Amino acid sequence: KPFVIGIAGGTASGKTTLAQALARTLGERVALLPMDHYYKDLGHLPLEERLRVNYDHPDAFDLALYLEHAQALLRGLPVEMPVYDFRAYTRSPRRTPVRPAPVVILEGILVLYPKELRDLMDLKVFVDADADERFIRRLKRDVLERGRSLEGVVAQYLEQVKPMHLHFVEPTKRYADVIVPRGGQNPVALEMLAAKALARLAR
Amino acid sequence: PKPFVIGIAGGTASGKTTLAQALARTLGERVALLPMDHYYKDLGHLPLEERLRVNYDHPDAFDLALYLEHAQALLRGLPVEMPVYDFRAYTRSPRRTPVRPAPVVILEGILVLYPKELRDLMDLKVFVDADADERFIRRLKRDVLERGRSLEGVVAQYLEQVKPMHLHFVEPTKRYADVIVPRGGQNPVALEMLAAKALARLARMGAA
Ligand SMILES: Nc1ccn([C@@H]2O[C@H](COP(=O)(O)O)[C@@H](O)[C@H]2O)c(=O)n1
Ligand SMILES: Nc1ccn([C@@H]2O[C@H](COP(=O)(O)O)[C@@H](O)[C@H]2O)c(=O)n1
């Protein structure tokens, strides 16, 4: 039975960088499933419709597939993780393999929203950061990595990201066992989480 | 071999006391707990009227000199006699609690993360978080049941001193925390994690 760590937080809160830093530190001893790659396959829909979809509402996620994969990893089985293309607004036809590990990390904005996911977690983490600081990083990454314009990032943020964060993401912090500030640069928290992950290993 | 120093701060009735005590009990004899809120300045020479007017949530109300001295002494393997503050009489009481040196030291209080000299002694910084309404509820209960206060007195002190000082001095210190612990009075997972970290540090002291 692998040690499961749930790492939630708002978009650009540092949850991704924290989860990846934990993955790099623990190396081969960790299987990481970023829930942001599990958006539903809406490839059959016209581009214009895909551009309007609310990607911050729980309904936008393929929870069934995410849950299925988490369970497979928990049973020592490999999974074919989907790769979401943020520029094209679609799921890639090619999937990357994720091998089983003694430590499983489930990370994303809404990983603490469904009871089915929380029940699988031994440790629940919420990476906290003020909305203004997150918007800043969100704006930069969207423009530099996801082919978005400032105008588009603003429209989407105010009309979807922010409302959904307050309604769905933020409240899940109530389920967190530990809250981690400065997620993209917190050596002490990183080292501590890495040690706790090796707790079940040491038994 | 350098003791493991944990600072635990948070608003009043945040659960910082409960968490610190639970952590102390989990480590047993290998830990020394120093509650800073027993280190208010000794104003026993001033009359009650004056002592009642003091703002006990402002940094100036604390005997930081004594606190730092005691912390450093413990870090040097020397024992200390911790003063005990009498919250009913509004003054430092005659009682003292002897504290033996330990491989793990916990500095706990509403303002332990405020001064640089205290933060510099810490290996791990924890801030126990809780909503103001929930903290007030526990503050009200504790004050009436243990500190001889009335609901009217608690409300007045809270609105005029506790709250303003919390927002101006306590809350901002959360920025120095390495980890933030919610539900400090009922969080076995965070307790276990903190205890495990200390144990890991303890094992390192004996290994070579
Ligand atoms: N087509 C899509 C799908 C998701 N997203 C964004 O992905 C974000 C989270 O990315 P991480 O922050 O990479 O999970 C969500 O806040 C959502 O607004 C997007 O901007 N366009
Ligand atoms: N004479 C005093 C001294 C301190 N106090 C209170 O002690 C509180 C903290 O108690 P712990 O929360 O027990 O330290 C401070 O918030 C302060 O308002 C008091 O109510 N009367």
Curated annotation (Swiss-Prot), chain A:
Residues that coordinate or bind ATP: G9, G10, T11, A12, S13, G14, K15, T16
Record flagged with keyword Secreted: no
Enzyme category, top tier: transferase
Keywords (A to Z) from UniProt: ATP-binding, Cytoplasm, Kinase, Nucleotide-binding, Transferase
GO biological process assignments: CTP salvage; UMP salvage
Superkingdom of the organism of origin: Bacteria
Keyword Chloroplast: no
Compartments it resides in: Cytoplasm
Pathway of action: Pyrimidine metabolism; CTP biosynthesis via salvage pathway; CTP from cytidine: step 1/3; Pyrimidine metabolism; UMP biosynthesis via salvage pathway; UMP from uridine: step 1/1
SUPFAM superfamilies named in the record: P-loop containing nucleoside triphosphate hydrolases
Protein name per its UniProtKB record: Uridine kinase
Species whose genome carries this gene: Thermus thermophilus (strain ATCC 27634 / DSM 579 / HB8)
